[PDB]
């Protein structure tokens, strides 16, 4: 997270950390949507160009954490993965189209003040909140700058959703309908963006209708981090809601 | 908070009915340091 700040305790209880057992390493961000399912980005699990194709036993999810490095005994819960599901039409060859994946925990986790699932949007909520100008929130333990460079505590930053035409003109990469972009424009003054290590994390918005937090997107990709004229791209979660349902109602 | 579950609790697991409400914030009617910025963005 670039140009953000330290999250408060219990501020993002659905925040999940994707972790590599050995050599121990923070791989990505993810989000807790129930006691059994975790949502993240497909490229965090699968990316052949870099020889990446993790399996259930390669990873470990850490839930309810605040500190990046220390073991938060009696606070965080560590769960094994039972199975990983990557979207069939996930395009890792070109633009990372449909960059989403689901991970089923081996044993359901218990909720607490530090562990709580986020809501996934319904058609109505997504239609009214995913508008240019509205701000969402991104969290993660990724790098603090493009070039320890890593934070000691979970970071958070609020970023404005950007008009589709502008997102399209800010890059040569083909942008699809299951993608949206966020971030401040060069002349808006404020800065901020997701960065290496934040991928897979949630882009959440608070509903003004029912006070609940909804996950509108998943940190997907960007060119560099917090560069003027560039924007972070996110997987449009509602757009891929059918695949999520399909996978879950079957396992 | 009015909310209608969408997934089958059988396969989805428990937790959806009470989703998006944080124990240390919404549940106690306490706001975090920057959520006001999000709400204002709906007006500005």
């Amino acid at each position: 997270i670039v140009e953000g700040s330290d999250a408060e305790i219990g501020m993002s209880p659905w925040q999940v950390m994707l972790f590599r057992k050995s050599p121990q390493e923070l791989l990505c961000g993810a989000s807790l949507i129930s006691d059994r399912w975790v949502l993240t980005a497909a490229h965090c699990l699968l990316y052949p160009p870099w020889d990446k194709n993790f399996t259930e036993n390669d990873l470990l999810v850490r839930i309810g954490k605040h500190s990046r490095t220390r073991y938060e005994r009696n606070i965080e819960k560590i769960s094994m993965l039972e199975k990983i599901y990557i979207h069939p039409r996930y395009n890792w060859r070109e633009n990372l189209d449909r960059n989403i994946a689901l991970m089923k925990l081996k044993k359901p986790v218990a909720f607490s003040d530090y562990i709580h699932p986020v809501c996934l949007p319904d058609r109505e909520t997504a239609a009214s909140l995913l508008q240019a100008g509205y701000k969402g929130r991104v969290t993660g333990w990724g790098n603090l700058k493009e070039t320890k460079g890593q934070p000691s505590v979970l970071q958070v930053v609020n970023l404005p959703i950007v008009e589709r035409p502008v997102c399209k003109d800010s890059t040569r990469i083909r942008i699809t309908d299951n993608m949206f972009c966020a971030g401040y424009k060069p002349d808006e003054g404020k800065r901020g963006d997701a960065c290496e290590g934040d991928s897979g994390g949630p882009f959440v918005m608070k509903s003004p209708f029912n006070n609940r937090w909804y996950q509108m997107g998943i940190v997907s990709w960007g060119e560099g981090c917090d560069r003027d004229g560039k924007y972070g791209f996110y997987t449009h979660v509602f757009r891929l809601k059918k695949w999520i349902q399909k996978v879950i109602d079957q396992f | 908070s009015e909310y209608q579950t969408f997934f089958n609790p059988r396969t989805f697991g428990s937790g959806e009915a009470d989703c998006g409400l944080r124990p240390l914030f919404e549940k106690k009617s306490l706001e975090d340091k920057t959520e006001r910025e999000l709400l204002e963005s709906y007006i500005d």
């Binding site: 909140l129 100008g133 | 500005d44």
Partner: peptide
């Protein structure tokens, strides 16, 4: 910059 308040749901 000219913004509409969300409504419904």
């Amino acid at each position: 910059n000219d913004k509409y308040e969300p409504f419904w749901e």
